[model samples]
Target: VSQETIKHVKDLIAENEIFVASKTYCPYCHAALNTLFEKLKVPRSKVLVLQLNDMKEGADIQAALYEINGQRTVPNIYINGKHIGGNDDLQELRETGELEELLEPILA
Candidate 1:
């Protein structure tokens, strides 16, 4: 695995409004993205989504994320460079209205 890959992910997290390293075939990833764009009213264009299963070194990218955040699961999302956890945690935040609170900064 390349350390460059890890840095790339870190740079990506630093650059986007919402960033998620996802898998096209992951059901959780699918629902998580939907909940983000649909329920949270986050503009679809503001999201930086990578379908990791569709890319080479996808696992390496994920491994890098694990080192970055200690979270070893997919649908790894970062909002304003803040780790927001998964679909369940997302919905949990939404239930508490914090997702929208976190969502307020981006006009896009």
Candidate 2:
């Protein structure tokens, strides 16, 4: 698995409108990614994917994006340059009918 330090994760959190930073062996991550892939199938080309290593990457991502707020976890997500939590949060957005809104071209 590739490793991204806190700095890299922070840059990612700041640079992209929509981003998915996930691990290779995480089942939940896979599920979330697959669900997103299905929902975003039509616009897959527009989505940006950033695959990372294991806990190391997650830790870095957590520190980079959420050190101040105490947020930590894998499958972290950001949309429109804002922190939107992770796979669970994405699922919630879908349930609440807000995922597509965040997936607008500008967000991509």
Candidate 3:
């Protein structure tokens, strides 16, 4: 499990323009990441899964290491090195179609 966690975390930390850290079955995480790639339907390989149960590192390191200083919680979504808050915030952004704006700096 830890190995898998490392694999997923590494992928996200490597070149994650819009990365989402989540477990296999997290509704909030799923909803957030899902809405991001709703129309295009990106491949699963592009996504990362850091199972909370297998996270060897604590939440602080997990948050600070990624340079995301938002509320420490699961499904830490970052877009182009900018902390975009959590799943709920994502939904709010999507509600107002601000997702694209939030991703502008990185998308460009």
Candidate 4:
């Protein structure tokens, strides 16, 4: 299951410029979404948020996340096909003003 889902997840990351694999019940995941939507003003179309917990192969997806990301945590983020880590990592990028800078071209 995980092996199959891993390929799917990889393809998703490759296809979308901004991808976020999040869990609905995770507070940090919520924070990451809020930061991107409210604080950063990123358009909905520009980002894709997958609620892994709600999916049938959620566990497998999580397993793939762990294998690929080195962390099986919620709020796994990717920008322009580059892994950017989780909520705290996103917050750090925001705090350091790197997030907006990094997003300038996409947002522009």
TM agreement with the true structure for every prediction = 0.90, 0.69, 0.58, 0.91
lDDT of 4 by residue, 34-60 (tens): 989998889998888999889887778
Off by over 4 Å in 3: 1-14, 39-49, 54-70, 103-108
lDDT of 2 by residue, 45-83 (tens): 444666667454554554565553355666776776677
lDDT, candidate 2, at 8:
66
> Candidate 3: which pairs clash?
none
**In order, what lDDT does every prediction score?**
0.86, 0.65, 0.61, 0.87
| Cα deviation of 8, candidate 2, in Å | 4.1
The most accurate candidate by lDDT is 4
Q: Look at candidate 2 and tell me the lDDT of residue 88.
A: 80
Whose lDDT is higher: candidate 2's or candidate 4's?
A: 4
Residues 1-108 of candidate 3 have per-residue lDDT tens digits of 255544555456667666666655667777776766774354555545456546666453365534435455667776655667777887677679777576565444
Which of the predicted structures, 1 or 2, would earn the higher TM-score when compared with the native? 1
For lDDT, candidate 1 versus 3, the one ahead is: 1
How many residue pairs collide in each prediction?
0, 0, 0, 0
Compare candidates 3 and 4 on TM-score and give the better one: 4
Which of 1 and 4 is the better model by lDDT? 4
Clashing pairs in 1: none
